[model samples]
Target: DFMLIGHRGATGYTDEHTIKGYQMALDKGADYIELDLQLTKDNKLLCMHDSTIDRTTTGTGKVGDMTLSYIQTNFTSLNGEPIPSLDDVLNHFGTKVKYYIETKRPFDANMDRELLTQLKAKGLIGIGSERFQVIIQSFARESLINIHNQFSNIPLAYLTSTFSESEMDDCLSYGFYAIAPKYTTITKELVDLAHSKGLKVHAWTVNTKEEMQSLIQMGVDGFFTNYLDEYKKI
Candidate 1:
């Protein structure tokens, strides 16, 4: 079956990264909940999309410059929901739905190890068990390698806005399971090429029915979209 991944947890329905947003996506039949990870100054991980808190939260400042407590008290959703930690998500969902986690800005050197430890502690890193699990993804090559070297079993995807032969080779050489590109970057040729190399091609941020149908026609393995229900209609 083609995968339907919820971008920032059905952001079209609710505030992105909030518990409500993610839970809504899951209830709406999303196969995967996509979240972006950012490191706070105190080294805690939070479910936030932007490098700064200005866009999505009430507070203002870079996540890397603010402590977890500071952001907690200072920032909240437009509707007043508190910013959630990655721990919050795991504690609530466990393996009920798979997670597509992007390692965003200020790429923490120790993030991969810490995240692996957290998932393992919760028994969310194994091949099969109760439900769909987790996959680590990033635009940062270092982050991908760091997680790959330590947890080879967990699937990894390389995220890129532009397609390149050299980069595709690197993804294949690194033995990643998939390549996640901007929806516009997807083409029949790219999809066929990636499939030939035994890699899946999943496009990101695809929201409209027209584009979703087109991507499906191109044979993409999956898509990350804000409108999960709309994509399901496709």
Candidate 2:
């Protein structure tokens, strides 16, 4: 059966990636907590989706050039939840909930390695240790490979906006256990193709209840949505 993954921890209910959003998603019975990661000015991995914070937070400018402390202190969610660290997230949700961690680009080379090290410190290894249901996802193939190299035993999910013929093969070559494609683009043919190679196909950012139910019937291995309450019925 497909899993119901919350996008940015219930963004539709609260500001994305905030503790308020995460808690709401958990209360709604989401199967996984999905979050976007970016590098701060000091290269710390923190939870914020885009390159710029202007759209989502009080600050303006690129997230990669701002200090973690500034984000933590100055950026408050619409609901007043503070900006959270990668470690903070793990400490809060580790083993308590499954996580789909997406490292957003262009990644700082060191951030990927640092993420694995911190996940280990936070006791969030998936399937091989305390964190059985966690999965590391990324758009940057290089960062994925680097992370794979550092944590060779952990499962990785490679995310694609669109897939051409060699895409599945390319992901498999990169050691991706799953391929998370954009929801509007997935087809059963793609799912079959991925499955033929032992690669699972998950879809992202599904919003409607009907769409979620349809994707579930379409055999998606999992899906991401900002609308948490809509997906919990699955």
Candidate No. with top TM-score: 1
* Per-residue error (Å), model 1, residue 86: 0.5
**66 in model 2: Cα distance from truth in Å?**
2.6
Native RMSD of candidate 2 (Å)? 2.1
Backbone Cα, N, C clashes tallied per candidate: 0, 1
Per-residue CA lDDT of model 2 for 1-234, tens digit only, reads 667788888888778988778878889878878878878889788888877777777778898888999887887765667888887887877677888788756655777777777777765763357433678888788878878777776778888899555878878788888888898888777777778889888898899989888877778888888887776565
Whole-model alpha-carbon lDDT for candidate 1: 0.84
Q: Per-prediction RMSD in angstroms? A: 1.9, 2.1
Q: List the residue pairs that clash in candidate 2.
A: 127-132
Per-residue lDDT over 1-234 for candidate 1, one digit per residue giving the tens place of the 0 to 100 score: 688898999798889998899999989988889888778898888898888888988788889899888988877987799999999899988866789888753456777666777788888875454433788889888888888887777788899998767778988888788898998888899888888878888898888999999999999999988888787577
For model 2 the TM-score comes to 0.90
Candidate 1 stretches greater than 4 Å from native: 105-107, 126-132
Alpha-carbon deviation at 100 in model 2, angstroms:
0.8
| Collision count of model 1 | 0
**Model 1 residue 170 distance off true place after TM-score fit, in angstroms:** 1.3
